[PDB]
Amino acid sequence: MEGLNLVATALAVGLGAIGPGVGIGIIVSGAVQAIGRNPEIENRVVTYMFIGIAFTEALAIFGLVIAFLIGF
Amino acid sequence: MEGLNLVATALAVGLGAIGPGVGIGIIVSGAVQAIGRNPEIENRVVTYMFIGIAFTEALAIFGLVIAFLIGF
Amino acid sequence: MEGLNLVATALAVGLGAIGPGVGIGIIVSGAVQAIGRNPEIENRVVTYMFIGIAFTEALAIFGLVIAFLIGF
Amino acid sequence: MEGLNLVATALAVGLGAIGPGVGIGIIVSGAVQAIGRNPEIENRVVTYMFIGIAFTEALAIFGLVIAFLIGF
Amino acid sequence: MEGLNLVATALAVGLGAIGPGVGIGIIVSGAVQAIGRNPEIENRVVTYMFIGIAFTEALAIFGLVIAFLIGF
Amino acid sequence: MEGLNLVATALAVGLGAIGPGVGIGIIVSGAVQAIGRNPEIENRVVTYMFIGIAFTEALAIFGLVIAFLIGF
Amino acid sequence: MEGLNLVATALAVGLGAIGPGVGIGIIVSGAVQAIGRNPEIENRVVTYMFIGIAFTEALAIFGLVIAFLIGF
Amino acid sequence: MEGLNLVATALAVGLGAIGPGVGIGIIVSGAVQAIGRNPEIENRVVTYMFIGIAFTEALAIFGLVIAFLIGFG
Amino acid sequence: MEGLNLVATALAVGLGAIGPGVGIGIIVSGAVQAIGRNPEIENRVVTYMFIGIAFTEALAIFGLVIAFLIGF
Amino acid sequence: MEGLNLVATALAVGLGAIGPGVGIGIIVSGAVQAIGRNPEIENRVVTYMFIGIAFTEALAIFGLVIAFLIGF
Amino acid sequence: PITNSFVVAIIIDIFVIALAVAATRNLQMVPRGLQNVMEFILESLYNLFRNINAKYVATAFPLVATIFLFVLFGNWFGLLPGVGSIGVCHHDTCAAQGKKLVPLFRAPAADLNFTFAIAVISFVFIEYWGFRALGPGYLKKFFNTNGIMSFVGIIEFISELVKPFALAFRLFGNIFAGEVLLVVMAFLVPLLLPLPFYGFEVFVGFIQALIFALLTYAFLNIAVT
Amino acid sequence: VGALIISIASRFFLYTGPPHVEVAAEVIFDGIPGFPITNSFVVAIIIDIFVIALAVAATRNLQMVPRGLQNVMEFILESLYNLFRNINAKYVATAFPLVATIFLFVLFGNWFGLLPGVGSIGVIHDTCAAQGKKLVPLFRAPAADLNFTFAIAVISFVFIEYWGFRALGPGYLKKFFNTNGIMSFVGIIEFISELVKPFALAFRLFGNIFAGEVLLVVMAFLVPLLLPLPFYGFEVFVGFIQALIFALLTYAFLNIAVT
Amino acid sequence: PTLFIAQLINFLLLIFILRALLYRPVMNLLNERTRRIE
Amino acid sequence: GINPTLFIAQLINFLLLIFILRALLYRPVMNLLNER
Amino acid sequence: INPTLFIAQLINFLLLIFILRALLYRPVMNLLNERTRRI
Amino acid sequence: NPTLFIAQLINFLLLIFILRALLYRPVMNLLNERTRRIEESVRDAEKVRE
């Protein structure tokens, strides 16, 4: 086909955010709930939440750059 | 052929929202549970709640804009 | 292919609902549980529950509008 | 093709039923759990239960409407 | 594609049985947990459980009738 | 194609087992948790579990009926 | 279409297990948690756990047998 | 569609394995939490834990063997 | 229709990896939560944690090797 | 088909990363919940969180390198 | 030129003006009637806004109330009989001399023109009030302030811009979907079938009308923060 | 030890030497007129006689003091007895001979399947493929045969049905038919699941053994050295777990039928 | 159109049926607010 | 495509309605505040 | 799926079960019960 | 097949060595503990008999 690369770009973009979005949501929810349970652990909880979010963010960028390669 | 772009836009828009939506839902649920646990931490938990919401919405908007590029 | 726009818009509108619906349900359940734990905090619980619901439903709105653009 | 409208309608209906069903299930489970925790605010919490159910059913209605448009 | 109508009819039921299936399960589990936590509010929460079950079953019936129209 | 009926039946059964299976799992888990919390309510809670499991299994029954109709 | 029945059988087996597996996991995890919470009540709750397990396994074997029908 | 059998045997193993993995994870989490709460009942409940785990892996094997049969007729 | 082996391998890898990731995530989450609940009992918990991790990664390796069959 | 390679690369990147998009999030959420419930066990639980992260990123990198093979 | 939805929007505005005139014609303590209901609605809205942010609760309160009243009027007009059945002509009643039988009453929210104005007004109010007491800090990205914190700020900036457009698109989709669901139910059966949906339509419209104002107040508070 | 991880022996004939797949679902050894005995059946024979010799040696001069083979066999039997009593304590002795022999035979069949040469020994190109006759492999695991696994499953089903008839009477109204209530709808699903159970068990064991055999063979094909060791261990664990759970599920189903 | 007329009749009937029940509690709330004004 | 003139007219009508509502409710708001 | 092979496998399994009951299960339980009987 | 028997046997010997170096000790310890408990019970029974 001729527009199949466009479908590939869509699949890379669409499937590259399903996992990371849910992971970020779960991480933020757990961090906020823990902070509400104990405020004093705020600094370390925020740091670990940032690390976890950064992992999934890089995982989404993995698909984003592949889509850009096809897009460019 | 001759419509694969439409399918690509559809797939990008769809799969680019099923993860971020659940992430936002979980973020809000955890934030509200923490709020119910203690009210005084609202200003400190609304911020990170909005950070997670911004990340998820950024992923979703990335999917939407990539689809729009194909649509255009 | 012929009529591919129809399946495209159908896929877009369908996939725009599975994610946001679960997120909205989780948001509502968490808000209800928190209100049950603390009655008097409903004023600050609801004002964030609706904004989270709107953020989540924005993705479904994006799905619907893209389906309309493909359908029309 | 000759029946691509049919598969489009079927996919739209099914996907629009997948999400809102789970959302409604979660909403009702949380509401009933809170009511069991505190029956005294039964009306107060059912007030929000119904309004959440309405938003959740909205996506299913959207999908059904699009499917009817393609079906007809 | 001659059995395209057949695959559409099957797909409609298959995907429409997903969301309500999980929703009814979640509703029943929440109602059961509340009953175990509070048998005294039996009828009041059973009514809401039946309300949610009726909504999910209505969505499933919409899927089934769409499939029946397609098959017929 | 040719064997579209076969893949139709396959999709019907698979997607009709995807949802109701999870619904049964959630129902039984909630019933077990309630029993662990309160064996005294067993006589009514198991009845509610059964009236929920039947409704959840109804959609799988519909899927099997459609599959057999196609196979016929 | 040059071997569509193979894809049919694969989808029947593949889609017939992802749902039931989660149901089995949820059932047995809830059973384990309730048993740990209440070591005393074990004799009869395992009965409901196993009837749910049997129902879920029958749901999966429905798709397995449907696929085996096409295999012959 | 000469390689449709390849996609078939890929789907038969890919699909049908997602559910077993989540089931195994849920079983492990529940059993571990329960034994952390109830240490002395671990020697009794690990059996049911493995029962559920092997049920999920049985479903995964049901997918695997069908995939293998598809890959070789 | 050449190159279908590539997409076959890709689908095999993706659908055999998406499950195990969630499985190991839940395993580690439950293990760490129980360990934090009581660090007194660790080895008799880390043992089962690694048992589940090995089983789930083994299923992932099943998917990986069956994919490399088409790859090789 | 002159383009199935790109779609296969997209599937290998996107799919196979959803599971390693949610498992990481669940691991981090459990870790931070344990950290809030027990701060003095920080190093011990952080090590196990990193163990789970490495286990999940193993599958993630497997999918990525498989995509690179398809891409190359 | 003008379209069908413009007439309905003008009718909604005229009805709002008439209701305000009726309420203000006899203004006295202990109201009982239409004035009492209007005062109760205004007081509930003020309480909800003060719950979000009392500092700016009365800042754009008239604009928010006008938007909410217009949305409620449009939602009520959608389910009313005569909308979509009377055709102006540029089997159907206008089958002879076919001109698509353009509906006389088109919901103002069911169009992308009337809905777009609300988004622009909300975005302008948020940017102005947000930057009124913040200057560069309202849109400050915090460039490498907290370890490359600019990435978080840039992503959040697009969300704030899309929020008003998202709200307008949500309102338009809700109105159009309500109208289309009513039409589909009418096509399915001639009477008594649309009861499950027609009743839910009014509740959905009221919920959306309240939610628009609540979201505007919350966004203003977030902007003020 | 240190950091001596080099894997130099691993990079030895990655896929050139060992044959690509060379697997089969069912093969027949024959050798006699009439009944076509298979290699899987042959292994079932050698496992059976090995089990008999092991039992005789354990019982050879049975002493009150346990030691060695007698001690370990007693430990295994008593652990199984306690495990089965933990579910039901009224019918342990009745079903014990069947359950114990099922577990013992399945465990040894699975473990023997992982012995070297089960794919290499038979009556890329190896030995027989050089000649004009196909190389049928010998020493096939009994659980790799459906005719064995289905036989075990049908035996277990007959046993459970006979004992569920012998106890609780022949009523079965919970699964046969109910007059009113949703119990009528419940009973048919119960009957369907009960019919499924033997097929499910047989397919479970057969697949979980045969797929393991296939995986070990194919991982011997690619990078044959030093990599499949953890997978051999995992397959040992899988065989043990399957052998245990078959008996456990059998007893659990029997007890639930009693209830 | 006959279908349009029937749909309008059904919509009006449903609106009136909902409005009576809604106004009953709404009338009670309005009366309570008027009483609580002074 | 959207009619810019129609959107401008709708915006003008909305602004006029908002101004009229504010003018009308300025007195009602004052009365409500004085009562409470 | 050979019915003769399945019958042969069932016969072998039944013979193994009988042999184990008559040689292994009976003595092991007798020895095991003796310890409790001694206790 | 003098190409996979060697690989399997070489792997088999390594697996046996690993099992003997990782699992033989705990199994031997458990068997010895059971034997010691049984022997103590038997000695107590004999002494009570005598």
UniProtKB/Swiss-Prot annotation, chains A, B, C, D, E, F, G, I, J:
Residues in the signal sequence: none
CC terms in the record's Gene Ontology section: plasma membrane; proton-transporting ATP synthase complex; proton-transporting two-sector ATPase complex, proton-transporting domain
Main location: membrane
CDD domains linked: ATP-synt_Fo_c
InterPro entries tied to this protein: ATP_synth_csu_bac/chlpt, ATP_synth_F0_csu, ATP_synth_F0_csu_DDCD_BS, ATP_synth_F0_csu_sf, ATPase_proteolipid_c-like_dom, F/V-ATP_Csub_sf
Pfam families, per database record: ATP-synt_C
Keyword Mitochondrion: no
One Gene Ontology term from the biological process aspect of the record: proton motive force-driven ATP synthesis
Lipid bilayer topology: Multi-pass membrane protein
Compartmental location: Cell membrane
Annotated TM spans: 7-27, 50-70
Keyword Chloroplast on entry: no
Protein name, as recorded: ATP synthase subunit c
Organism: Chloroflexus aurantiacus (strain ATCC 29366 / DSM 635 / J-10-fl)
Gene name per UniProt: atpE
From Swiss-Prot, chain P:
Subcellular location(s) of the protein: Cell membrane
Domain of life: Bacteria
Transmembrane segments: 1-18
Function: F(1)F(0) ATP synthase produces ATP from ADP in the presence of a proton or sodium gradient. F-type ATPases consist of two structural domains, F(1) containing the extramembraneous catalytic core and F(0) containing the membrane proton channel, linked together by a central stalk and a peripheral stalk. During catalysis, ATP synthesis in the catalytic domain of F(1) is coupled via a rotary mechanism of the central stalk subunits to proton translocation.
Similarity comment text for this entry: Belongs to the ATPase B chain family.
Quaternary structure and partners: F-type ATPases have 2 components, F(1) - the catalytic core - and F(0) - the membrane proton channel. F(1) has five subunits: alpha(3), beta(3), gamma(1), delta(1), epsilon(1). F(0) has four main subunits: a(1), b(2) and c(10-14). The alpha and beta chains form an alternating ring which encloses part of the gamma chain. F(1) is attached to F(0) by a central stalk formed by the gamma and epsilon chains, while a peripheral stalk is formed by the delta and b chains.
Annotated protein name in UniProt: ATP synthase subunit b
Organism: Chloroflexus aurantiacus (strain ATCC 29366 / DSM 635 / J-10-fl)
Originating gene: atpF
Full-protein residues shown: 7 to 56 of 164
